[PDB]
Write a protein that binds this ligand. Structure first.
Ligand SMILES: CCCCCCCCCCCCCC(=O)O
Ligand SMILES: CCCCCCCCCCCCCC(=O)O
Lengths: 363, 363
């Protein structure tokens, strides 16, 4: 009878732009070994990141000494809150603005992050400051990683199709900068070169199938998941005494290489399509190997997913948020004379799990 | 067209029973003051708890010294994992056992906890060890507190009604014992006297309304939420360097007193019933003030919610899990000759939010 649709959308990020050249220079200062300082310069170079938005400054000496201290986890969580509320309120609002709905119509808020833990959290502030119904259904989704926006979209899809008349509001926000530390190990150095801050927001609504939908609407055709074997170590998320971390496996790129195509293939098979029918590839911009290996698993030229590279270059990895950016860019660039430019988004989660969705943008 | 139903259900807990008399004695030893040692004895007495199940021992001197140490948060999270996987796997299985369905029918797993953070986490192990489809949709719900099973049920309700043919599996597990510490403050002493360990599991399925449903089925009539004003401080959840905490306000009981009736009233009004039509009150057994004040807000004798007191007495507060226990007891005790014994469950979440549901048990 029915099918889900993105009716509004928006993005935001901390004002502070941080040039990768500076970050690399600032980090290189610290190591002062011939091999060590060299290794670091090389790592930052390979990231394909020009800038990241960061709510906390790596410039301030006052923040420097705090980052050194042990047992600060709780202060960082409060700091996530202190910076996230205005950002998330602002972006949620912008997603709702220019829509013809009463707040009474907004029946779900799915809040998403893997970079702060605190309750009552940001989700409550969204409903208070935006004036959403206090009877709103809420779901807080945590530690589902870079791919968490797919899990959130899937959840909102189920809401609006089960309650046609109502809308679902999804908000993702990630403040990696809040969890920044000094490098105990190689993985610390790598992680701290990639992750940035950002938030994104989506309003989802139902639709009777074969309605003349608005232009700019994105239709959630289908969603998909695959939990993989032999790749528990791929993406790991933890809570340390001095911050939340993500620990990546050296083998993650080959995990991704071996898993992307068959998963995406099977999805297309069950949807009755081919790589030929896909105009857009919203590969999560987690890093250069993540895009490269996704693309080389599929049959596609690396640089085809141009929005993914663009977002990585400008923002870095904003975990769950990145794919919202990718999608907003894709809606902006009407790159075809076709009525529906259709695409596939996917990302990777601890498991390893491949999460994604097929969608048609209504031009 | 349709409405949701609980088709299977199960509970479990750490083997180790801890008598409150011992716990109180063990904790009283630690303070050596006339007022101090006295105050503590009084607190434990007031809890209305005989026993709690605990995955970690308060007996072992080896565990004693670890509980003292700072910055152990990450080890505790791994410890949550080490103990949660078998429990959660076992209970999820038992919820599924004695059911006709193939694993291909299980399309959602909503995993719930506010007492450990780790990825890849327990949810992945449920699908691996239970052999559930790897294409299963997952949602991990964290820090939604004692009431999180209502948020999870609601979410599963939306899944099965949006995908009639499939089932949703909900698993809640809470291991407070993992987060145990030495008391920095009065609230630490109070918290450590109430919270225990437990898990529960639910299989939810769809149904065409006016089907002769099975006996023992519980029908999710409706769910409800209310985010309150001026009660941010009521229930607070945080992540410290040496464990996750919950900080309760002295005013929480009056927050509950002032909010339960109008919220529950309005729900009944929108469902067209009265307190008269409610045969069962599944008040979250968070503590004696929580039940007492809920009951005195509503028009009901305190001791009416007998399952709530029973569960508190035997297990303590197992946050999200407790209401599953309450419901399992209620299904067990067929207390009426009526065909449908109907009830209301609710609980309290950081916000403060009142979350709950109306249900008819098909007897
Ligand atoms: C999913 C958890 C993400 C954990 C983030 C830890 C790393 C934060 C990196 C923030 C950028 C800091 C770079 C710098 O030191 O200049
Ligand atoms: C939602 C977070 C709850 C944090 C719970 C921390 C304390 C749990 C108490 C476990 C019982 C410890 C035994 C005792 O000292 O009596």
């Amino acid at each position: 009878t029915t099918v889900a649709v993105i009716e509004g959308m928006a993005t935001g990020a901390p004002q502070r732009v941080v040039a990768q050249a500076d970050a690399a220079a600032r980090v290189s200062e610290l190591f002062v070994d011939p091999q060590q300082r060299e290794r670091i310069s090389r790592i930052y170079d390979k990231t394909r990141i020009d800038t990241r938005r960061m709510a906390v400054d790596p410039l301030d000496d006052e923040f420097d000494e705090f980052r050194r201290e042990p047992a600060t986890i709780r202060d960082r969580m409060n700091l996530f809150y202190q910076h996230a509320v205005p950002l998330a309120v602002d972006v949620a609002a912008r997603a709702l603005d220019g829509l013809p709905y009463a707040p009474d119509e907004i029946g779900q808020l799915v809040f998403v992050t893997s970079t702060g833990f605190i309750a009552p959290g940001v989700d409550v502030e969204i409903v208070k400051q935006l004036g959403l119904p206090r009877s709103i259904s809420r779901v807080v989704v945590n530690f589902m990683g870079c791919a968490a926006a797919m899990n959130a979209i899937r959840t909102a899809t189920n809401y609006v199709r089960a309650h046609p008349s109502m809308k679902a509001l999804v908000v993702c926000i990630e403040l990696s900068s809040v969890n920044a530390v000094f490098a105990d190990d190689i993985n610390d150095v790598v992680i701290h070169s990639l992750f940035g801050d950002g938030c994104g927001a989506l309003v989802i609504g139902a639709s009777q199938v074969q309605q003349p939908l608005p232009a700019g609407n994105v239709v959630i055709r289908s969603s998909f998941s695959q939990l993989l074997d032999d790749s528990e170590d791929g993406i790991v998320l933890g809570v340390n005494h001095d911050g939340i971390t993500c620990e990546l496996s050296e083998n993650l790129p080959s995990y991704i290489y071996r898993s992307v195509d068959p998963v995406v293939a099977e999805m297309l098979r069950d949807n009755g399509l081919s790589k030929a029918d896909i105009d857009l590839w919203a590969i999560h911009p987690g890093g250069p190997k993540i895009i490269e290996q996704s693309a080389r698993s599929l049959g596609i030229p690396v640089g085809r997913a141009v929005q993914s590279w663009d977002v990585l270059a400008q923002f870095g990895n904003m975990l769950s948020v990145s794919l919202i950016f990718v999608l907003e860019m894709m809606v902006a660039q009407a790159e075809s004379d076709k009525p529906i430019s259709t695409g596939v988004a996917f990302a990777f989660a601890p498991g390893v799990t491949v999460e994604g969705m097929l969608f048609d943008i209504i031009r």
